[PDB]
């Protein structure tokens, strides 16, 4: 190229100046770019550490407990690793030749329900599959989505149906380890870390209940698209109830200049907890609307409500109105008719409707677009937010439910869900068998945790 501009071309832009430019730029106290102010930070280090198991040997379908190790000034990261067993179908299965076996969608975020973190012997936090799905679908940092969908299953290999050994597809589901991070209040932000050095009189422990492998495997019919429970004799090698699972946590070490200075002082921290409303069964054939009474304690921040298809326990994370069916090419395909069962929703305080009967698309798209860091890519996942930024650790606008009386949420169902509830569909239509749906509501609230005299407690409770 022939660039005749040169440096001198910008002198005119520098020279041009008016009252607007004087008001915006300029001034003796105005800061400038190209100069970064540097400030010292604390001297520390971090390194992974094994978590000490104190409850027998982990196994599928059982509950196992692991303590938090000492000697670390702070713990700010926790994850679980689990090696899945090798699955190979047999021709002697109940379904015969017309039968495939595949892992359920979202293998992780499944088989981990009611995971809890307890101080001493007091339940401090607890989450489950619905909260995990909603949080990872609403506050997902883009760019790491591929990594998450490769590390928690759904890697397009574990979820592909595999025919019997004597059929065309004799591939066996690989046995590869998978990892699931544990979302806790200390793991939410670096600034919130557990003072293990300051809490020596409480046993910090993590209780994790896995799920039976019977309902973790989807046993699909090749032609009619039906699901039946899996048995031990159906697959080669049986079912191994025991499994090797580990918990890893990251510790941080700091110098004596402050690790002892901050000790002996009362510290108040703000944390985010979970409250889950009881699940209600919905039958669209009889009723067109369903009211759910919600009762919560502290300043709620967000409300996630979804309707889940619970026809088969084997299939999970199915918020569509029609169950998935097998498709050509040894792959699973969403059926032609697959829409969220909720047609509209509204929120009522006392006898006054704060939110009118707004459309489902509102909660589906508009609210995530404005008050979230991501928009879900799957049907369902309806959200309301009382705060400008859901994912912000700093408190934002929120309404306390302790002083608020009974509140209700009314969901008006869709004709697609109504017609899908009744069966009669042909093969591979998803709704060939009658469908049953359940409504789940999850809330996120703030709380205050106080550390004093080597122990922690809730000053408000």
């Amino acid at each position: 190229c022939t660039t005749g501009a040169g440096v001198t071309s910008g002198f005119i832009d520098l020279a041009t100046y008016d009252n607007l430019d004087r008001a915006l730029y300029g001034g003796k106290d105005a800061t400038t770019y190209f100069i970064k102010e540097h400030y010292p930070v604390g001297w520390f280090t971090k390194l992974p550490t094994m978590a000490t198991r104190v409850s027998g040997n982990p196994a599928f379908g059982q509950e196992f407990s692991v303590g938090v190790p000492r000697s670390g000034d702070y713990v700010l990261n926790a994850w679980l690793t689990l090696k899945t067993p090798e699955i190979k179908l047999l021709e002697t299965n109940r379904l015969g030749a017309n039968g495939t076996v595949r892992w359920t969608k979202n293998l992780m975020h499944n088989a981990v329900e009611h995971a809890s973190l307890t101080f001493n012997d007091i339940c401090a936090q607890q989450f489950n599959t619905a909260y995990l799905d909603a949080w990872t679908q609403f506050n997902m940092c883009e760019g790491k989505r591929i990594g998450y969908d490769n590390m928690i299953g759904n890697t397009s290999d574990m979820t592909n149906p595999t025919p019997a050994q004597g059929q065309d597809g004799a591939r066996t589901l690989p046995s590869k380890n998978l990892v699931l991070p544990l979302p806790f209040f200390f793991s939410r932000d670096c600034g919130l870390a557990l003072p293990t050095v300051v809490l020596p009189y409480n046993e910090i422990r993590i209780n994790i209940k896995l799920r039976s492998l019977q309902e973790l495997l989807v046993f699909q019919n090749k032609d009619t698209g039906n699901v039946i429970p899996i048995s031990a004799t159906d697959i080669a090698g049986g079912l191994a109830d025991t499994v090797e699972a580990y918990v890893y946590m990251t510790v941080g070490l700091v110098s004596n200049v402050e690790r002892c200075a901050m000790a002996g002082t009362v510290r108040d921290m703000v944390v985010e907890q979970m409250q889950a409303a009881p699940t209600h069964i919905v039958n669209p054939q009889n009723t067109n609307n369903v009211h759910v009474d919600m009762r919560f304690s502290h300043a709620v921040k967000a409300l996630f409500f979804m309707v889940q298809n619970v026809t088969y326990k084997s299939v999970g994370s199915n918020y569509t109105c029609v169950t998935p069916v097998n498709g050509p090419g040894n792959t699973v395909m969403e059926p032609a008719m697959s829409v969220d069962p909720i047609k509209s929703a509204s929120l009522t305080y006392e006898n006054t409707t704060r939110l009118a009967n707004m459309g489902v698309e509102y909660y589906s798209l508009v609210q995530p677009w404005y008050f979230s860091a991501s928009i879900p890519v799957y049907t369902g996942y309806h959200m309301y937010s009382y705060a400008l930024n859901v994912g912000s650790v700093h408190p934002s606008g929120s309404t306390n439910y302790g002083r608020l009386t009974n509140a209700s949420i009314t969901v008006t169902m869709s004709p697609e869900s109504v017609v899908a509830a009744a069966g009669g569909g042909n093969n591979n239509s998803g709704y060939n068998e009658p469908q049953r749906f359940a409504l789940v509501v999850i809330a996120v609230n703030h709380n205050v945790i106080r550390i004093m005299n080597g122990s922690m407690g809730f000053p408000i409770l």
Binding site: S297, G402, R403, L404, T405, L461
Partner: protein
């Protein structure tokens, strides 16, 4: 050991925090007649808040 569930409150939050917010009405100029006039001859008006 007071908690949220066992409090004697609820239903009274409006009367407790009744001063958190108020309602704003449309602005209106105050046009009032000063004198009605003498034998229906004179008279004038004054705008208090134009």
């Amino acid at each position: 050991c007071a908690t949220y569930a066992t409090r004697k409150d609820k239903g009274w939050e409006l009367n407790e925090n009744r001063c958190v917010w108020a309602a704003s009405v449309k602005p209106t100029s105050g046009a009032i007649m000063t004198n009605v006039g003498v034998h229906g001859k004179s008279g004038n008006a004054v705008l208090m808040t134009p």
